[PDB]
Structures are given as C-alpha cells and as structure tokens.
C-alpha cells in the first residue's frame, strides 16, 4: 500500500525520456516490453495490452507464494475472442492449464477504448465484474460461467457444479475512474489487491504514483 519510490525516480525518468522505440526492456514469461510499451504509463496515456498482460503474469508469478491464492490470468485477447467466436475458438488455449486447480482466474477485458476486469474466485464461488467507470456487465460473467461449464466438460468430462455461483458487478463499492485514461491502471490495481486477498484501498489520487511505480515494477519484474 505505501512504499516510497527512491532513486527509482531517476530510473523512471530515464526510460520516460525519448530513446529509440521498439527497444526491448524487461523480458519475462517469454514477453517483451518495448520502449513504446512503457510510454503508455507516462502522463495520462492509454495503457496497452503488452503492459497489462505483463503485469498479470507478474501477479501470476507472485501467486505461487505461501499465504496467497493461486492465480491464472488469461491474456487480454481471451474474453473478446470467447464472446465473439464461442468456446470452441478458445477451447484449446487452456490445454496446459487446469483452470479448476487454481483459486482465482483473472480475466482482463478490452472494450475497444476501455479496460475492465472480470474475476473468477473458486473459493468464494464468485464471478465478479469490475468497472472503474461504474458500468454493469452481468452478461460478461454469464459468458464466463458458460465457459466454465464447457471447460469442465471437454477437459474433465464433468458437469460443472453451479451452487452459489454469484454473477454480479460492482457499483460504487470500488474506486471510480474520475478521468478518461486511468482505466488500465484501475484494472491492474484491482487485481493486485484481489490477488493479495486485501481490500481495495486506493483512490484516483494514487494513480499518478501507481503509473510511475508500475514502471519500476515492470523493469525489475518485482511487485512491491
């Protein structure tokens, strides 16, 4: 929640200033973050898919620690593909992942010009939708519940059990966007506290600090 930002500000300003784009910085999970990618965290720029998916994989890496729920995060192209093309178009994206062996499923959702987060929590038996703009999208979780039913079959040949599987969206119970560009920041910071099993404590006033902190976190591949 707190943490300072030390001589990192010089390191953050070093990559914020202009250099040749496409120059790779930070490589993990067979993923690269070019200079163009990290530029989306500067000022009030719109975050892109490379920054979000890289951050989700870092939360995935932290999930292996004791005292934290195990997490599997879909890439930002999953929900868009599943909703528009059906389950059989994404049925083979999870041939090395048993989604029913983890505690939390992270589903980053791209909405053309907007980011949002849907979370599957097998512990609470919940499929929650998080929108920093206050939008309600219960159809998105009904899509994910139908995905789980078609995923328990085809992968385990078991009819998925659906008791207490609450499909709901958040209202004014999570901090709101207050501008028009910090959306990907809210989506990633939502998942950070959710994967830590900690309450969502931040507000919009923390986003400028979050953007520069994420720059250092991505470069060093270390979550703070």
């Amino acid at each position: 929640a707190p943490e300072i930002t030390e001589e990192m500000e010089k390191e953050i300003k070093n990559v914020f200033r202009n250099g040749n784009q496409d120059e790779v910085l930070s490589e993990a999970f067979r993923l690269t973050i070019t200079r163009k990618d990290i530029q989306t965290l500067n000022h009030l720029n719109w975050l892109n898919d490379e920054i979000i998916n890289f951050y989700m994989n870092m939360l995935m890496e932290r999930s292996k620690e004791k005292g934290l729920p195990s997490v599997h995060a879909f890439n930002t192209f999953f929900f868009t593909k599943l909703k528009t093309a059906g389950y059989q178009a994404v049925k083979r994206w999870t041939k090395k992942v048993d989604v029913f062996s983890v505690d939390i499923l992270l589903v980053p959702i791209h909405l053309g010009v907007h980011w949002c987060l849907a979370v599957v929590d097998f512990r609470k038996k919940n499929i929650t939708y998080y929108d920093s703009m206050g939008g309600i999208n219960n159809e998105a979780c009904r899509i994910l519940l139908q995905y789980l039913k078609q995923e328990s079959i085809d992968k385990k040949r078991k009819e998925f059990d659906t008791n207490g599987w609450q499909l709901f969206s958040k209202k004014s119970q999570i901090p709101q966007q207050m501008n028009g560009s910090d959306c990907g920041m809210f989506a990633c910071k939502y998942a950070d506290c959710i994967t830590k099993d900690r309450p969502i404590n931040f507000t919009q006033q923390h986003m400028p600090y979050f953007r520069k902190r994420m720059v250092w976190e991505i470069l060093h591949r270390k979550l703070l």
Binding site: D22, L44, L47, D49, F78, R92
Partner: protein, 78 residues
C-alpha cells in the same frame, strides 16, 4: 523437419508458410508484417492462445502440421 502452417488474420485472410523447427519464429513474424505494411509492434502473433515471441520455435510450441497462427492487433484503452 519442416511443416506448413497458415497465419489467419482477423479478416480471415490466409498467408501460408513453411518453417524448420528449433529455429526462431522471428523471421516468420517479420515476413508477415512486411506484407501488411504495418509495424510489428502493432501485431501480436499468438498460437492456440500462446504469445509467440521471437525466441519461440515450433518445437517448444505444440505446433504440428497444418496448424494455424491467429493474428491480433494492439489493444489500447482509457
């Protein structure tokens, strides 16, 4: 040895390729963007949901014959 595959774009257009294996797919990626005219920083080359980076080879990936590589574009959002 060698295997053929298709690189289907979001518009349903096919670009056929053959490749050796244990060789980086960086060259196949470069050839695809040289045709669409767009930068490669604009296009993501994903196979069966898995991001293909320049060091990935069809050996470490599951890719067999007549496989398909889905092509997606950059997602921005605010």
């Amino acid at each position: 040895d060698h295997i053929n595959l298709k690189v289907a774009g979001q518009d349903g257009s096919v670009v056929q390729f053959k490749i050796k294996r244990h060789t980086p797919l960086s060259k196949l990626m470069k050839a695809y963007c040289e045709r669409q005219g767009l930068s490669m920083r604009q296009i993501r080359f994903r196979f069966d949901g898995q991001p293909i980076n320049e060091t990935d080879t069809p050996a470490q990936l599951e890719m067999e014959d007549e496989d398909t590589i889905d092509v997606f574009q950059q997602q921005t959002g605010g």
